[PDB]
Design a protein around this ligand. Structure first.
Ligand SMILES: [Mg+2]
Ligand SMILES: [Mg+2]
Ligand SMILES: [Mg+2]
Ligand SMILES: [Mg+2]
Ligand SMILES: [Mg+2]
Ligand SMILES: [Mg+2]
Ligand SMILES: [Mg+2]
Ligand SMILES: [Mg+2]
Ligand SMILES: [Mg+2]
Ligand SMILES: [Mg+2]
Ligand SMILES: [Mg+2]
Ligand SMILES: [Mg+2]
Ligand SMILES: [Mg+2]
Ligand SMILES: [Mg+2]
Ligand SMILES: [Mg+2]
Ligand SMILES: [Mg+2]
Ligand SMILES: [Mg+2]
Ligand SMILES: [Mg+2]
Ligand SMILES: [Mg+2]
Ligand SMILES: [Mg+2]
Ligand SMILES: [Mg+2]
Ligand SMILES: [Mg+2]
Lengths: 187, 225, 128, 53, 147, 125
RNA sequence: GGAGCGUCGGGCCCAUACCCGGCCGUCGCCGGCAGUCGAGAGUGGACGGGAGCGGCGGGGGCGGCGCGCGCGCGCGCCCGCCCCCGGAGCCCCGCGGACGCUACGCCGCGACGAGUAGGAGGGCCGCUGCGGUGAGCCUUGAAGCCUAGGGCGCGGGCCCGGG
RNA sequence: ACCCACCCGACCCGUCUUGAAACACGGACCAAGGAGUCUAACACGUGCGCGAGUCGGGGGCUCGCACGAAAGCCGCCGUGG
RNA sequence: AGAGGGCGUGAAACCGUUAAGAGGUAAACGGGUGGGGUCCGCGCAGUCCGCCCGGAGGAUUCAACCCGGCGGCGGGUCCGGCCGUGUCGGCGGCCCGGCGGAUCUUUCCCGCGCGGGGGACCGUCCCCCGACCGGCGACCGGCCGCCGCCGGGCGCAUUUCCA
């Protein structure tokens, strides 16, 4: 008899993508290979991200991709995003970029290409740079989802600012006993 | 193209074979030295006492540096403070053992697990027999048997420890690099004690097997290793 | 002089008797078919000494000889002639079973074809 | 009983609602019927706009 | 797809995943939002702070269309018009400034979030913010009230 | 591609046949009857297939052109070899090895031909 | 003259505990393999001038970074070569690559495996009907039924023989 | 795998229970039947499509529906959510 | 009629018999052997096949080699032409290229400041040839090399067959 807890012996990370789609799975076959045979950890990070959920690979807006490449020095590079590239209607002038993405929305595609931008697929990125050399690996804001505003220290727990799940906002949906001082108390 | 490369590859081949020979010769001389070192250690303890005894004097030799610690009772109904220390000595299963350098900190940790272990001061031969018969590396967290020095070297060679013999000298003299050589060794899975024990549950002093038995840990080692 | 398989190792089985279902002996309503007991007290399900055994993955077959017939082959249940020609390039490792529902005319048609291709049949001398 | 976080929600299934469930298996059959009836009315008001006034 | 659901995997087991000390009885809490004050209170007042109690003024015959006032931010004002108004402008050389009827596009108020590009406009709208006005002037434009 | 359409097909094709813990495949110009990527007649730009001759004597090799698949009528190109066993193999060998065509296959193609030439002779006692 | 009681020896007895080995599964390994040298790896390769038995004349270190299977060499004859795998013949081969590669595949190393309530995963386990699909099976005998017949699977179960 | 013998092991299941072989209840035997369903609402997770949008209803245009009460299309494509 | 008028199939409980075996600790069960039965596989030697080789016997025809024909592959000179990506030149399709636009013009036209249609303009989609480059599985034609098949020749130190 041995004393170990077998409690957290199984690591819960993903191995493959849970999706069954065939084009992504080909990318996975390609980046598994590169991951293992190259020294590049870029390939490993990319590989890891191909297995993740929709939630877990959030969309990267065009404006966010602009400003991250506006940063000093990462000039004449390629931005990479395992998610999708979306438009920003609240940005106007779009520099000529180099981009990798699993998806780019039709607007975002036009705007970039009109600028003299190049768009790449991930099979194309590999041939272009199999060890991820000269890349900017970005990500969309993970904690964008409105979901997260309900997460945390519960509402009605002093110093929480945590959206309650409520049928409809309005004068008479919550905001009585436990928010006003006038009505019982407040947190 | 062809005959130039071939000779270059043959040259390479040879430069390896030369180096192999060299490192082998180092190993061979390192042992020979350690043979002389242990001889010198043994005699020069007797030397001392005889010289005290010549005068009306005493030679109180050094208190021991290093001790082997065997877990001699099982893994049921064991107090949480004991249990923690037993898994700070890596003594998880029953009849696992470890070398342990002694000092105020270490000794007291053995004091908190006394009726759960048999321990004491191993012989030279004990350190050899344990290492050669049951010497297993921790090599990428896989218990792997020390079949060659290429294993020991690969892991401990950044300390000057390049062979089984070096390892034995680091363990037995409790060198600078003891912590790292001792942790490299996977804890010794020894069999049951042949000829049996006296009594599991009681201390050595009082007839049983537990606690410090100092010199006599070596007898137990032989009947288990 | 039957068709020898490529390699005829020693199959070695961990357990030969069927695991049978608790109290299938006592009752005609209970069938031999194994069922794990879920009873709160249950001699069997809590592994007492002297009781019927519970199947584990412990009893599992060795992967080399799992599904290996005594003869050394694995079955493959052929349904008509066309379906045989698959085995053409195995023959030394797989044999052909013919199905129960196949007629005694075309049972014959299969058997002679397998005899050309040297695929061993596991129920040939039968329908007649 | 509520369990840890969720909309404290009021469904209106306390009356005998299954007595008054109104299915829509008609609707295709309906949609046609209107459409026939529509084409008939055109044909009746011969050169007049199908629209109406 | 019953095939996939949990009751298929519970077949054989006695309690059906509801335990055997306590069982699956009918309504052990009370039905629904029962006990909001008593015996379910803690859940109510640690996930629904402010359920209980009145507050504010009643309003009898509310009609929502009176208070209809959909807003738009300067952020994306140029989005309302075809790019070639924003292009034929930063060009032209008359200092023209094209009109943007915001009420046409379905927003009544113009609030002031965001940077407006240095490029004159005439924004026609039912209502404006203070800041939205200011930003518009700073671009070198003119806010315009409409009924 | 080859790989893309293997993704579409791997588990669903009419030619496949699971059952009895094995799997197989019945698509034509698959020597070895495997539901493999390698050994699949339909998928690959260059294909080998060694069937027996309809005569009952001999073997047919079945190359695929590359000229134009899209036009299956013209795509495969058959060739009977009805020669002294040892020769037959060598002709197949050269077809495969010295044309640099489907080099992966080739030994499987030889064993198939061999087994076919086993098939067609006086049987037994 | 214990087969009693107190003190102590040797010796022997056996648990699912410990050790070694087999086999099954699970976990872990930034695990390996989409076809390459390489085992404390501590380089490889142009290419130009100047030359040659020269070399890089550094620690009782006991040694790893440098040395004795060649660097230049045997052949063509001090000068030239030091040549190509469609052929070096291979323990490594960078020219092309499994018997192997259903990449949801295949392979290797370690570790571990009680379980109610409960949870999750996988079931080429099982039932009935639908779209597809098996140039499936079936009066030369389907379903069901029965079987001291033959087997497979850890098992749910399954397949064959005879009736 | 049928029967028999012998050595060792071995109390009857289900269940509520801190505790069941119980002097606790249910159960003579066999066959068939027999219990976590569906709708609605919410939340989180996951898969797919599109993405500052998205959406399909409801309605309409295309057929006697064999398959269709499907399928397709709509400045209705967005009244509206 | 092993379908006989409540009759297709005809399970189990339960009963009768026939056969076999047992029998003082209620039966039944798990593990482990033994004995007997039932069938099943044999063998009237199972010495099981397959390569390659050596020998001694018979056997027909060819490999090797060219020659003629067909088909296939691969290649570069991209040689010649079709093919298409990125770029530049034609402002050439632009009206013989259409849609879209809150871009413009009511110098226009038609219908009643508005609707429809022109006409500018911008965005997008197509012709002409030249140049550079990815020369891309997107194809043809010749030439080359290699492979395979058919037919010619090659009569036997080759060539398969058979025992
Ligand atoms: Mg556990
Ligand atoms: Mg205890
Ligand atoms: Mg105790
Ligand atoms: Mg209990
Ligand atoms: Mg109307
Ligand atoms: Mg539950
Ligand atoms: Mg219950
Ligand atoms: Mg409860
Ligand atoms: Mg377990
Ligand atoms: Mg359970
Ligand atoms: Mg109770
Ligand atoms: Mg009680
Ligand atoms: Mg009980
Ligand atoms: Mg009692
Ligand atoms: Mg009761
Ligand atoms: Mg009763
Ligand atoms: Mg039933
Ligand atoms: Mg969701
Ligand atoms: Mg009848
Ligand atoms: Mg009847
Ligand atoms: Mg009937
Ligand atoms: Mg009798």
């Amino acid at each position: 008899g041995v004393d170990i807890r077998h409690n957290k012996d199984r690591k819960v990370r993903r191995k493959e993508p849970k999706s069954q789609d065939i084009y992504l799975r080909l990318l996975v076959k390609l980046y598994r290979f590169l991951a293992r045979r190259t020294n590049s950890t870029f390939n490993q990070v990319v590989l890891k991200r191909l297995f993740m959920s929709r939630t877990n690979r959030p969309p990267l807006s065009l404006s966010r991709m602009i400003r991250k490449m506006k940063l000093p020095g990462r000039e004449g590079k390629t931005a990479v995003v395992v998610g999708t590239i979306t438009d920003d209607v609240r940005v106007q002038e779009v520099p000529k970029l180099k981009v990798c993405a699993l998806r780019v929305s039709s607007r975002a595609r036009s705007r970039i290409l009109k600028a003299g931008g190049k768009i790449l697929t991930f099979d194309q990125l590999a041939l272009d740079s199999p060890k991820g050399c000269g890349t900017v690996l970005l990500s969309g804001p993970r904690k964008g989802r409105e979901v997260y505003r309900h997460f945390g220290k519960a509402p009605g727990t002093p110093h929480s600012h945590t959206k309650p799940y409520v049928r409809s906002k309005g004068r008479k949906f919550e905001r009585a006993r436990g928010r006003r001082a006038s009505r019982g108390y407040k947190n | 193209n062809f005959a130039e490369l071939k000779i270059k590859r043959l040259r390479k081949k040879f430069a390896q074979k030369m180096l192999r020979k060299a490192r082998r010769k180092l190993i061979y001389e390192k042992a020979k030295h350690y043979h002389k070192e242990y001889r010198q250690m043994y005699r020069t303890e007797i030397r001392m006492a005889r010289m005290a005894r010549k005068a009306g004097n005493f030679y109180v030799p050094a208190e021991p540096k290093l001790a082997f610690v065997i877990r001699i009772r099982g893994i049921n109904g064991v107090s949480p403070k004991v249990r923690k220390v037993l898994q700070l000595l890596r003594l998880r299963q029953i009849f696992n053992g470890t070398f342990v350098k002694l000092n105020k900190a270490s000794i007291n940790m053995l004091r908190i697990v006394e009726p759960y272990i048999a321990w004491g001061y191993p012989n030279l031969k004990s350190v050899n027999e344990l290492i050669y018969k049951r010497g297993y590396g921790k090599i990428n967290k896989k218990r792997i048997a020390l079949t060659d020095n290429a294993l020991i070297a690969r892991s401990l060679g950044k300390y000057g420890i390049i062979c089984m013999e070096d390892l034995i000298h680091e363990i037995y003299t409790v060198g600078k690099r003891f912590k790292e050589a001792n942790n490299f060794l996977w804890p010794f899975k020894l069999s049951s004690p042949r000829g049996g024990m006296k009594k599991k549950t009681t201390h050595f002093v009082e007839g049983e097997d537990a606690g410090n038995r100092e010199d006599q840990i070596n007898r137990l080692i032989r009947r288990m290793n | 002089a039957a068709l020898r398989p490529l390699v005829k190792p020693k199959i070695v089985k961990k357990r030969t008797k069927k695991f049978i279902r608790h109290q299938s002996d006592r009752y005609v309503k209970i069938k031999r078919n194994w069922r794990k007991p879920r009873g709160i007290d249950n001699r069997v399900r809590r592994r007492f000494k002297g009781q019927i055994l519970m199947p584990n993955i412990g009893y599992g077959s060795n992967k080399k000889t799992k599904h290996m017939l005594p003869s050394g082959f694995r079955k493959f249940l052929v349904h008509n002639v066309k379906e045989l020609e698959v085995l053409l390039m195995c023959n030394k490792s797989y044999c052909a079973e013919i199905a129960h529902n196949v007629s005694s005319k075309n049972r014959k048609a299969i058997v002679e074809r397998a005899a050309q291709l040297a695929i061993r049949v596991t129920n040939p001398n039968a329908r007649l | 009983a509520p369990s840890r976080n969720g909309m404290i929600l009021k469904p209106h299934f306390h009356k005998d609602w299954q007595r008054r469930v109104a299915t829509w298996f008609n609707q295709p059959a309906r949609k046609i019927r209107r459409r026939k009836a529509r084409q008939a009315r055109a044909r009746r008001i011969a050169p007049r706009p199908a629209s109406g006034p | 797809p019953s095939r996939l659901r949990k009751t298929r995997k519970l077949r054989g087991h006695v309690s059906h995943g509801h335990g055997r000390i306590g069982k699956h009885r009918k309504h052990p809490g009370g039905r629904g939002n029962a006990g909001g004050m008593h015996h379910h209170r803690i859940n109510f007042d640690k996930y629904h702070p402010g359920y209980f109690g009145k507050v504010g003024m009643r309003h009898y015959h509310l009609k929502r269309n009176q208070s209809f006032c959909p807003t738009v931010n300067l952020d994306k004002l140029w989005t309302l018009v075809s790019e070639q108004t924003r292009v034929n402008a930063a060009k032209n050389k008359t200092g023209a400034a094209p009109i943007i009827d915001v009420v046409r596009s379905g927003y009544y108020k113009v609030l002031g979030k965001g940077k407006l590009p240095k490029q004159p406009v005439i924004v026609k709208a039912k209502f404006f913010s203070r800041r939205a006005e200011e930003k518009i002037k700073g671009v070198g434009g003119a806010c315009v009230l409409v009924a | 591609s080859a790989h893309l359409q293997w993704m579409v097909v791997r588990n669903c094709s009419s030619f496949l046949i699971k059952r009895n813990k094995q799997t197989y495949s019945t698509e034509p110009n698959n020597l070895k009857a495997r539901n493999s990527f390698r050994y699949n007649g339909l998928i690959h730009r260059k294909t080998v297939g060694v069937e027996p001759a309809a005569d009952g004597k001999g073997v047919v090799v079945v190359m695929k052109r590359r000229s134009g698949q899209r036009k299956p009528a013209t795509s495969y190109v058959r060739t009977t070899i009805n020669k002294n066993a040892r020769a037959t193999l060598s002709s197949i060998r050269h077809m495969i090895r010295k044309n640099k065509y489907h080099p992966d296959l080739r030994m499987a193609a030889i064993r198939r031909a061999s087994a076919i030439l086993r098939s067609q002779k006086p049987v037994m006692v």
